[PDB]
Amino acid sequence: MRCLPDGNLLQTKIHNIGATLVGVDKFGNKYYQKLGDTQYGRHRWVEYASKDRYNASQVPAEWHGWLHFITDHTGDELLS
Amino acid sequence: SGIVATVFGATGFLGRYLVQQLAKMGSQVLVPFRGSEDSPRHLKLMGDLGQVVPMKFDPRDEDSIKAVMAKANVVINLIGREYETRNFSFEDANHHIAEKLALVAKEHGGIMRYIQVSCLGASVSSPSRMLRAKAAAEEAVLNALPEATIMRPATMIGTEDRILNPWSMFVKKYGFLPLIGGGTTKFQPVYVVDVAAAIVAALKDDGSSMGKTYELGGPDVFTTHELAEIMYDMIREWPRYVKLPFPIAKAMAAPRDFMVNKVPFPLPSPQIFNLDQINALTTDTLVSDNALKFQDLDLVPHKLKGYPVEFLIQYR
Amino acid sequence: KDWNTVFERSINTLFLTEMVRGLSLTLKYFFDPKVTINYPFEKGPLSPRFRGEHALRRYPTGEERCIACKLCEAVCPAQAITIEAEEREDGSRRTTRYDIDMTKCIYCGFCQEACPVDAIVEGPNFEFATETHEELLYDKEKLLENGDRWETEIAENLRSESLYR
Amino acid sequence: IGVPPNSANLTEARRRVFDFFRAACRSIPTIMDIYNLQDVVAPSQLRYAISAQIRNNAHITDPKVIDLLIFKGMEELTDIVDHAKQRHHIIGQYVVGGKTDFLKNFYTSNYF
Amino acid sequence: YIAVPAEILGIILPLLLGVAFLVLAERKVMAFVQRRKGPDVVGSFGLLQPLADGLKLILKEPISPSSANFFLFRMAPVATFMLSLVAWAVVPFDYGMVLSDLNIGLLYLFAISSLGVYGIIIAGRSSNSKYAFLGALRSAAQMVSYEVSIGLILITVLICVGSCNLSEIVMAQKQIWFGIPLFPVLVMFFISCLAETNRAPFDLPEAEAELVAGYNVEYSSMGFALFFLGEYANMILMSGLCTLFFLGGWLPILDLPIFKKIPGSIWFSIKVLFFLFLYIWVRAAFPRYRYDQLMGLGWKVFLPLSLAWVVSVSGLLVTFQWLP
Amino acid sequence: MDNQFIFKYSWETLPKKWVKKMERSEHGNRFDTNTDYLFQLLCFLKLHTYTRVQVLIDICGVDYPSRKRRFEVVYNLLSTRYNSRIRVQTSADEVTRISSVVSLFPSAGWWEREVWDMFGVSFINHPDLRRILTDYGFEGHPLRKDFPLSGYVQVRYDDPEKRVVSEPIEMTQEFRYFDFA
Amino acid sequence: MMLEFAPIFIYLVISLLVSLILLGVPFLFSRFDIRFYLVSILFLIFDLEVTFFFPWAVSLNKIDLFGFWSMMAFLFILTIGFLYEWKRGALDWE
Amino acid sequence: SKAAEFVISKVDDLMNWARTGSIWPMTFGLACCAVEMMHTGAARYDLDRFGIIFRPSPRQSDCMIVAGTLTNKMAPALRKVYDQMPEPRWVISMGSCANGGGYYHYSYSVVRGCDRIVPVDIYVPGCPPTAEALLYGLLQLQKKINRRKDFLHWWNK
Amino acid sequence: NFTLNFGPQHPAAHGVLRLVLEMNGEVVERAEPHIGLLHRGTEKLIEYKTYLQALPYFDRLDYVSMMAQEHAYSLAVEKLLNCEVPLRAQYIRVLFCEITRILNHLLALTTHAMDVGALTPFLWAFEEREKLLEFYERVSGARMHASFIRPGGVAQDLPLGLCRDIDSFTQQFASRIDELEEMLTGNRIWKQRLVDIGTVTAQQAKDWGFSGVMLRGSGVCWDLRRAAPYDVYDQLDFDVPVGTRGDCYDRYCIRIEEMRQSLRIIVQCLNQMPSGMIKADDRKLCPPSRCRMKLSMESLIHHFELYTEGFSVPASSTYTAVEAPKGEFGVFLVSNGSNRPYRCKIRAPGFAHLQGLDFMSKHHMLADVVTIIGTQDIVFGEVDR
Ligand SMILES: CCCCCCCCCCCCCCCCCC(=O)O[C@@H](COC(=O)CCCCCCCCCCCCCCC)COP(=O)(O)OC[C@H](O)CO
Ligand SMILES: CCCCCCCCCCCCCCCCCCCC(=O)O[C@H](COC(=O)CCCCCCCCCCCCCC)COP(=O)(O)OCCN
Ligand SMILES: NC(=O)C1=CN([C@@H]2O[C@H](COP(=O)(O)OP(=O)(O)OC[C@H]3O[C@@H](n4cnc5c(N)ncnc54)[C@H](OP(=O)(O)O)[C@@H]3O)[C@@H](O)[C@H]2O)C=CC1
Ligand code: SF4
Ligand code: SF4
Ligand code: SF4
């Protein structure tokens, strides 16, 4: 129901359709990828655990590099 | 300076000038505010980084009060209101809060200097209920803190004053200016900057200001008609005074005072037809010859004409 | 010059023929996919070299890397670093004070280049806007907290970039 | 209009001084209006301040120094008139509108 | 007459909603041409953006600068907004779907258009600002200039129809839409509508970056919103007028039972939507003229062509006796 | 047109009293001249068929406090005709006006204003010589070596006056001079 | 019949009321350029031309050839005036 | 007052939703930071999609972005423009120059932080901050606006 | 005559642009720019910095063409030091200079177009700008102020895979240029806004010190990359477009063509890029590797010296100029033998170009002033310093 007032979250729900779950972090944020080519193959995004009051600073360090295409290592591989 | 001052009521007219002057002397200023965080925003530019610190408090709550006071050795109270709201009466706004602040300062233990700002006409036998509550608060603070200092400025003049600005607004919106008492009451209006300077000077002395009340009046004595004329020379407009006798003015100021404590929603504040101020206009409010003036603080107050009234340029 | 060319010029002027091509290729982009990033769920690409928020690092033992050589303070083009140092109780050469004024800093990375022990780095964080100027005056403890928070990414980036520097 | 050559001697430099003083004095009403000084200071006090500034440099004997002082005075007058920075008791560089000095300075600080 | 206010509200309120969403549609189409998204956060697909912007505007403190024209300054946006609203009283959306079936409706629309200039002029003069005054003068001159061509094109349609009644103008196109034989006249009418509504490539008030201050620069809060709303309502009205005069109003494309199934109001709406899309598209496609260039176009190009079309249509219809 | 030809031809053709010093170096050909001949030298170089120095690239001052004439004014010029650059320099002090070259090169107008603003050197026959970079009412000439880096005054908003105002500077943390010499 | 003008008046009253509500709710919480005169004059002339066109346009079926040519003569006079304005530079804003 | 507080909080939530959903900044584009700000408004980040529309006149603006170095010569112009902004209004300081003077801190001609001239609500660090950093700063502004309780504070005043 | 005071306090028209115009109706009689609103004392600050600490000031002058000014300053320092730069570094420098030229021309063209009301090309061009900013960030870790080009060469070598991505960009950039052109070049409104606006004769251009596109628009074939070549420009094929009318339209066309030629140069640099060192090998002026400094005394000592005192430059003085995207950008550097510049005079083309606004805008309409400002390509960081 958050989709109706929050259009930003709606776009993520739409683009999650057909996506692959890559992992979940300690805060419950979920990480998805597509493996296509629309934004030059950049298809990584995060669904924040809190559907309201989400904030970019909630991405932990182990997943920050993966989210920003700095590294191809997921948060799980970095933690191991 | 190593002075840490908690200035209550610093989001009003006199507060900005007082905070500017306290920051000039290097003091750290704490600014308790009761509502929106944007109310003390204009004070943040004053002083260096970290020097002015606004802090949320509640008046009707003792914990918040000692919380904002917990770090200070100087407390200045400017809280007051010349009208009434359904939430705060004249005695609630002008006597109860001041007594509570004095009591918390007593239980604090560390307040070296306490300054309570009052009004010049503050007396028990005053027509204005606000002035009566002001005198009561003066007595209450003195009883709770015999070493406290009391300031009694006259009507203050400045960019955000509540006398010349309402007059200019009313004239520019109607074309004429009423005179409530035939334009005969005398009062010595005072530059707000001078009041701030007197407070700073009493904070700076070798201790001689403690226990004493100072009557701060402007250099000159005027009639309300005489001030209305400085306003017209400055606003470059054609004067047109209309005599409103006291019972008529009280009639036009009766509705708000009547229905303020009955209707359950806020009312707009009175500009000219405030009943209590009209009652105050019945008598003349002058600096007593036996009081302590701007002299005995080694200060000369500024004359109104020119710079104190330069904000009136905006109305031309 | 010739009736045909004059006629063709007149028609083209009257019928706004060249205005049609602009309309057409504006309309072509209308149906193509958009390049907008759905921030904050999606982010722009960055590199291991990205110069973001400074951080102070420790050895895996927990010991600080910084030995108060003051090279970063000397090289800093903005004079944004302030250091005090003394012999620690165990005899170690260590900072007592390490301040970076985040509002003077130009985020040039010179300090990270100057440091001989990889103690000060500009990490990958760029989302640290504040409500007060005083929160941007970083002291040593804040920088060490940054280092603890971002250590895994910083170490990965250093492993990646050690083959160029 | 253009920057004139340096004064050849003290006579022509004095003539330039008199011209500058006339131009400065004639601009006093404009300054009074711009800074709203009607109730702050008399126009003659402005004239007196300008003349006092001219007199404090009456010992100068080099025409080039006089020409430079006149040029700087013209620039300062132009900035005062064209690009006024209103303060209160201060226009440009001038303040408008029983113990010796040593004791006061000693009470003030250790840096005299 | 007791139910007349209900009809009037059933016109005015959906029109205000339509304007609020025309602003959003302009933003969306402009974005999509520019390979971006445009509003999509405030509400799903950005559909709550207009309500948020309107709420922000009503919650904004009004300024009302210390001018000597205190009454005129606030009344100018009221005048332009009311004029934008009242033209819809005579607009028919389908057969019998019209508030006022004026026999003189065409001339009434011309009169409203001629009245539109006063809000801009008064806003410029009353604001006590030389830049606003100059911009208002230029905008007013442009609108009066293109009003001449609009009136002459109106006369061409009137010659074809023989009645000033808008519904009669629609029903006279049952045989053929006037936009087919008079296609250049329709192009001229659309361009003149662009210029008359101060729209790109004729949007002088939008040319702040070109050192040309708009007439509404001193306005804030709801006076500025009133100017904006009147402008966009006038855009919708100009699209509706293009639909009525040249695309056969509520009529179907082909007189066939398959097309007659769908209601006439839907035909009218679809044509209006096409013209609004063209408004946005044109704003997305081209740079703007200078004031002098557009004035030259108004007087040197569109007036002579409009007059020539009047003469040619009347002469042809008189010659072969095809008059209504 | 190489720097050997320019040096030799200028020695052969220029009036002798115009040039006090001539340097030929890969760092640039350089002519030093008294202030009273600067204008005529530049006019010659611009007009003469074998030089055609048509572009004035810039004018700048350099402060040398140890010198009786502390200021050195440098003219960088270009010949697009011969694809060559020339530097012409003259010295000046705090009170001696030098000739403007605006009538020769209109581009000089603002560069001269800048020299006056930054260093305090004045230019005879300059049509409009006022400061161009500093704040209105600025005092001093910031590029002089004795002018302090942070200056003498700073500005802040003053709520009681409802305006931005200027006060003598006060530095929270002073500029630290690191002497590595 | 003039009956159809009454809804227009009621519409005006309602639109005015909407305007006042919208505008009033936030109060709770020396260089003469002759070319403008000239463009005004031209607009006046062609405004009257449109005015005279209206009855002619609705009356063409009854006035036939005589009315057509009389209006043509009217237009010829006005267009000679327009040519005069064009040649004199009244239509140039540069 | 078990019913008045709920309605008051709902009103304040509506006001905050409106004010966060339509932020109309005026840009004070002074130096290099203005280029990153232009990129934030461009297609990749599309400030339009958050309801953020840039206005030419302070009269139609709710926010001022100070993007670049503020000189002493420019300070009066910045303050006057700020004083024409109608309430409620916010200021975002973008980049080291606007934050505290940055690389020019010790210069004779530079204001050492725009917060000496106007009250600042959000400081965005960087030289320049990335376009995404500016977007993060604008989301922090939304967070600050969402703590407002204007209706409640006025009811109790 | 009336006086219109125009200051756009927003980057729509610069941002610190301030103009006093005298008008006769809508006709401009005199245009007087008031500058210094971004004067930050750069030339004074530089004298208090070591030669390395001074380098970031040059990114912030024409802050749309960052690496070009970096390059000019490095070249001046190299000239005074007699320092030899390795070939690979030369090629990287030229490659980044031409990327910068494209970055500058896209911004200039589309901001001008938006000023005269064409909104879409700005968005289209800024996406390509974003791709080029990504190359800046991949090599330096900064989108704009890279401080990547340095005395002796470049700060770091290219990351693996960068050349391939640049090649991918070049394979599609010509279509983007074509789209911009079809939007603008043939459009009658665009021509009416630019043809015969701001005409400049060759004599006027020389008299007012014009350079770059401002000079080549008037028919003067002059490009420092060919007249006074530096780095590897003499090994590269490119054409120098020149105008025939000297107006705004000619300069727009020249900028489009310059983007095409820059694309050509980038392709050549990509194909001819050699292997080897990216820093000068003289061990008295360049930082050692991190591993060398952690392993070798001599290296550690040199690192300590370089990052505390910086290198010395023997006493001398010279003027060095490059063909920046906005025209001739020059540095007059005076060294006294110490580790800090004694004097650094910066010669900005925008200073000359904006001074020419008075004669260029004479007798034009008010709306042409912004067009003329746009064709000059003014950035006040370099005008004011
Ligand atoms: C911008 C366009 C400019 C057009 C300029 C060219 C035309 C100007 C008008 C010139 C006068 C008419 C020239 C056309 C010749 C054909 C006339 C014709 O066909 O004869 C018809 C008759 O045409 C006329 O007689 C009309 C003449 C028009 C009046 C022109 C004025 C001439 C002088 C008038 C003197 C009055 C004083 C002038 C005051 C200024 C026959 O009609 P009917 O008799 O069969 O029946 C009458 C009708 O059908 C039923 O109503
Ligand atoms: C189903 C689709 C329906 C679509 C309906 C709307 C169509 C779209 C309309 C909008 C199109 C884009 C609008 C933006 C362009 C505005 C700029 C117009 C500029 C302009 O008017 O130029 C004039 C020519 O155009 C003109 O003159 C325009 C009027 C043309 C009328 C044609 C007149 C003769 C036609 C032949 C008739 C013969 C048959 C009858 C016997 C000449 O001015 P200039 O200065 O620009 O010159 C330079 C010429 N390169
Ligand atoms: N002419 C004059 O101005 C004169 C005034 N005085 C007295 O001097 C003092 C300062 O004057 P001035 O600055 O003009 O006063 P203002 O009315 O301008 O400011 C009053 C201050 O007190 C605060 N305040 C008022 N009521 C309450 C309350 N119930 N709880 C908490 N805070 C409250 C206000 O807070 P908020 O902004 O949040 O409402 C504000 O900060 C007052 O005591 C006044 O009565 C003396 C003589 C004449
Ligand atoms: S990033 Fe540069 S300016 Fe900032 S602290 Fe590090 S060295 Fe100093
Ligand atoms: S951070 Fe590095 S360079 Fe700076 S003092 Fe510590 S060890 Fe030295
Ligand atoms: S903070 Fe950095 S990028 Fe921003 S204006 Fe200042 S120097 Fe330029």
XYZ file of N, CA, C and O in Angstrom, chain B residues 307 310, chain D residues 27-37 75-88 90-93, chain F residues 135-138 161-166, chain H residues 72-73 75-77 80, chain I residues 18 34:
196
model
N 18.510 57.408 13.107
C 18.866 55.991 13.027
C 17.861 55.073 13.712
O 17.486 54.054 13.107
N 15.085 54.945 11.275
C 15.431 54.638 9.855
C 14.659 53.430 9.278
O 14.423 53.415 8.084
N 29.330 67.252 -3.944
C 28.634 65.979 -3.832
C 28.068 65.731 -2.438
O 27.534 64.646 -2.187
N 28.185 66.698 -1.527
C 27.699 66.495 -0.161
C 26.187 66.288 -0.096
O 25.745 65.387 0.632
N 25.347 67.083 -0.780
C 23.895 66.822 -0.701
C 23.489 65.435 -1.180
O 22.599 64.808 -0.583
N 24.133 64.930 -2.234
C 23.847 63.575 -2.696
C 24.168 62.556 -1.613
O 23.401 61.614 -1.389
N 25.294 62.740 -0.926
C 25.684 61.835 0.150
C 24.703 61.921 1.313
O 24.330 60.899 1.903
N 24.271 63.134 1.665
C 23.301 63.289 2.743
C 22.010 62.557 2.418
O 21.428 61.894 3.285
N 21.549 62.661 1.171
C 20.346 61.944 0.765
C 20.558 60.431 0.799
O 19.724 59.688 1.325
N 21.683 59.960 0.253
C 21.899 58.522 0.101
C 21.991 57.842 1.461
O 21.418 56.768 1.676
N 22.701 58.455 2.402
C 22.904 57.875 3.723
C 21.879 58.340 4.754
O 21.978 57.938 5.917
N 20.907 59.168 4.367
C 19.869 59.666 5.276
C 20.483 60.326 6.509
O 20.312 59.880 7.643
N 21.168 61.429 6.291
C 21.921 61.976 7.430
C 21.293 63.225 7.995
O 21.855 63.713 8.934
N 38.757 58.241 -6.300
C 38.214 56.886 -6.288
C 37.355 56.651 -5.049
O 36.270 56.062 -5.135
N 37.823 57.111 -3.887
C 37.061 56.928 -2.657
C 35.741 57.691 -2.707
O 34.701 57.174 -2.283
N 35.760 58.915 -3.241
C 34.526 59.673 -3.414
C 33.559 58.951 -4.345
O 32.353 58.883 -4.076
N 34.075 58.407 -5.448
C 33.227 57.700 -6.402
C 32.583 56.476 -5.766
O 31.391 56.216 -5.968
N 33.355 55.713 -4.989
C 32.791 54.543 -4.324
C 31.779 54.946 -3.256
O 30.768 54.263 -3.062
N 32.038 56.049 -2.550
C 31.095 56.532 -1.544
C 29.771 56.909 -2.196
O 28.694 56.578 -1.686
N 29.829 57.587 -3.340
C 28.613 58.068 -3.989
C 27.942 56.955 -4.789
O 26.751 56.679 -4.613
N 28.690 56.307 -5.684
C 28.081 55.362 -6.615
C 27.753 54.021 -5.966
O 26.739 53.407 -6.309
N 28.583 53.550 -5.040
C 28.470 52.206 -4.475
C 28.447 52.267 -2.957
O 29.220 51.600 -2.267
N 27.556 53.101 -2.426
C 27.504 53.356 -0.995
C 27.304 52.070 -0.204
O 26.451 51.242 -0.538
N 28.102 51.905 0.842
C 27.943 50.824 1.809
C 27.504 51.477 3.113
O 28.326 51.846 3.950
N 26.208 51.632 3.250
C 25.666 52.232 4.494
C 26.026 51.484 5.780
O 25.819 50.297 5.822
N 26.613 52.143 6.765
C 26.751 51.600 8.132
C 25.890 52.598 8.921
O 24.855 52.990 8.406
N 26.230 52.868 10.169
C 25.398 53.880 10.855
C 26.238 55.136 11.003
O 26.108 56.047 10.176
N 29.194 55.716 10.291
C 30.465 55.612 9.522
C 30.199 55.765 8.029
O 29.389 55.000 7.537
N 30.865 56.690 7.345
C 30.804 56.747 5.847
C 32.218 56.410 5.350
O 33.129 57.068 5.806
N 32.413 55.341 4.585
C 33.728 55.000 4.089
C 34.729 54.791 5.206
O 34.681 53.780 5.913
N 35.638 55.751 5.373
C 36.678 55.688 6.389
C 36.504 56.713 7.503
O 37.365 56.802 8.381
N 36.591 44.478 -4.110
C 35.326 45.029 -3.644
C 35.363 46.552 -3.682
O 36.419 47.175 -3.563
N 34.191 47.154 -3.865
C 34.097 48.606 -3.882
C 34.597 49.177 -2.562
O 34.327 48.634 -1.491
N 35.358 50.265 -2.645
C 35.933 50.839 -1.446
C 37.083 50.061 -0.846
O 37.479 50.353 0.285
N 37.628 49.083 -1.565
C 38.784 48.341 -1.080
C 39.965 49.278 -0.863
O 40.177 50.223 -1.623
N 21.515 46.159 12.173
C 21.502 47.076 11.004
C 20.791 46.507 9.778
O 20.632 47.234 8.834
N 20.409 45.244 9.807
C 19.742 44.572 8.659
C 20.597 44.706 7.390
O 20.047 44.868 6.356
N 21.902 44.577 7.536
C 22.785 44.607 6.343
C 24.122 43.892 6.513
O 24.499 43.609 7.615
N 24.768 43.633 5.384
C 26.140 43.077 5.403
C 27.073 44.243 5.714
O 26.893 45.274 5.147
N 28.000 44.008 6.588
C 28.913 45.068 7.058
C 30.359 44.558 7.103
O 30.542 43.381 7.243
N 31.344 45.476 7.143
C 32.763 45.133 7.170
C 33.385 45.488 8.517
O 33.178 46.588 9.035
N 33.262 38.765 -0.899
C 32.760 39.914 -0.152
C 31.945 40.833 -1.055
O 30.929 41.393 -0.629
N 32.375 40.985 -2.311
C 31.642 41.800 -3.274
C 30.238 41.253 -3.520
O 29.294 42.019 -3.727
N 28.366 39.206 -1.418
C 27.556 38.926 -0.229
C 26.293 39.776 -0.108
O 25.232 39.214 0.212
N 26.323 41.101 -0.317
C 25.065 41.867 -0.225
C 23.990 41.396 -1.194
O 22.812 41.356 -0.824
N 24.394 41.000 -2.406
C 23.454 40.490 -3.442
C 22.812 39.185 -2.952
O 21.640 39.016 -3.095
N 20.281 40.071 -0.113
C 19.059 40.703 -0.604
C 18.145 39.681 -1.273
O 16.926 39.657 -1.025
N 27.020 40.296 -14.254
C 26.420 41.576 -13.901
C 26.707 42.561 -15.019
O 27.871 42.858 -15.303
N 30.311 44.291 -15.073
C 30.902 44.497 -13.757
C 31.348 43.141 -13.230
O 30.520 42.247 -13.034
